[PDB]
Amino acid sequence: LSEGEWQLVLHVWAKVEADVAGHGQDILIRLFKSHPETLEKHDRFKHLKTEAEMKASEDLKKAGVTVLTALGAILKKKGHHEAELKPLAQSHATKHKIPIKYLEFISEAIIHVLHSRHPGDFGADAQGAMNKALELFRKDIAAKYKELGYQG
Numbered sequence: 001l002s003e004g005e006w007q008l009v010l011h012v013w014a015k016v017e018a019d020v021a022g023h024g025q026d027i028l029i030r031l032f033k034s035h036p037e038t039l040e041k042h043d044r045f046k047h048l049k050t051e052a053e054m055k056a057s058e059d060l061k062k063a064g065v066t067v068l069t070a071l072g073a074i075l076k077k078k079g080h081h082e083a084e085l086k087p088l089a090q091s092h093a094t095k096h097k098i099p100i101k102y103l104e105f106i107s108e109a110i111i112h113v114l115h116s117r118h119p120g121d122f123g124a125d126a127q128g129a130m131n132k133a134l135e136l137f138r139k140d141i142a143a144k145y146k147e148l149g150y151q152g
């Protein structure tokens with residue numbers, strides 16, 4: 001990415017950082033409504049049925065913060081993220097078994113929620129920069145998955 005593209009990514013991300021849990025809820029709810037098979041991966045809360053149940057769930061709220069905390073740390077490295085990807089790839093490839101296509105699905109949900117919440121900070125320039133950042137994440141985590149023997 002260019003330095004300007006990185007700055008656009010980090011600009012909108014600072015808006016996420018104002019309420020990380022609420023953004024995480026919205027992104028996971030979007031993911032699970034759009035791609036219900038992904039909910040099955042979360043044993044603690046895979047039985048949730050309605051949007052209201054999802055919003056009330058403490059476990060789902062914790063999960064959203066876990067994801068966004070880790071992704072924010074990755075984005076702030078501006079591509080220089082091998083050390084942060086290493087433990088993530090280890091668990092996601094060998095324990096949770098999250099295929100790349102699920103990482104595509106959550107990327108779509110992140111983009112949807114950022115555009116819904118922050119359109120004036122998420123125009124075409126910024127959306128393209130975030131798309132590039134999230135594609136770089138997925139490309140590099142895929143390479144690390146294969147190093148670990150996982151072809152997902």
Ligand code: HEM
Nearest residue numbers: 038041042043063066067070071088091096098102103106
């Ligand atoms: C931006 C993408 C993602 C990030 C940064 C992320 C990050 C994290 C982190 C930091 C943890 C806790 C430590 C660990 O187990 O490694 C975790 C756990 C987990 N992740 Fe992810 N993750 C992402 C995408 C996903 C997706 C798309 C799924 C499912 C479709 C998923 C399923 C899980 C599961 C099942 C756990 C174990 C805990 C639980 O059941 O809530 N991850 N992830």
